[PDB]
């Protein structure tokens, strides 16, 4: 599980989205594993504004931040799941690391700021939806 809170906004994955993240839908992407709602508090979370591709990461399954170097966001194949059939993801960013289904929510951070969240995993290879291009959630 896991959430990034800005201003207004609440990120979510899509797949683990609640039934009041679709009451107060703001944007969605099925493509991108991605989900914002409104929230009535104010949020304080820094979104970074970089190219940065280093990076330390919150795994729930280990209760550990690990360091990782990670590719910059592309179009990746991601195998079919309950969720949604075998399709290419968008925005995704993979790094050599640990990750398990439950680790998805996560934040991904730079040194500037929330990078994006942990979204897929397999094979060794976490993979991140990356949220640095999404200018609207400071604005
Ligand atoms: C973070 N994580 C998810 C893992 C999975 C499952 C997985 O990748 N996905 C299932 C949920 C939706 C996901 C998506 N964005 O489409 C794909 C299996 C093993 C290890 C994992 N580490
Ligand atoms: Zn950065």
Redesign the pocket.
């Known amino acids: 599980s896991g959430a990034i809170y800005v201003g207004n906004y609440r990120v979510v994955?899509?797949?683990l989205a609640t039934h009041n993240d679709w009451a107060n839908l703001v944007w969605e992407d099925s493509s991108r594993?991605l989900l914002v709602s409104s929230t009535t508090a104010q949020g304080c979370d820094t979104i970074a504004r970089c190219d940065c591709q280093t990076g330390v990461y919150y795994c729930s399954?280990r209760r550990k931040h690990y360091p990782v170097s990670f590719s910059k966001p592309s179009l990746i194949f991601?195998?079919a799941?309950?969720?949604?059939p075998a399709?290419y993801?968008s925005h995704?960013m993979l790094a050599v690391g640990?990750?398990?289904?439950?680790?998805?929510g996560?934040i991904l951070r730079c040194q500037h700021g929330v990078v994006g969240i942990?979204?897929?995993?397999?094979?060794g290879l976490?993979?991140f939806?990356d949220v640095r291009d999404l200018l609207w959630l400071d604005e």
């Open positions: 994955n899509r797949h594993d399954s991601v195998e799941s309950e969720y949604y399709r993801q995704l640990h990750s398990e289904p439950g680790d998805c996560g942990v979204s897929t995993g397999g094979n976490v993979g939806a």
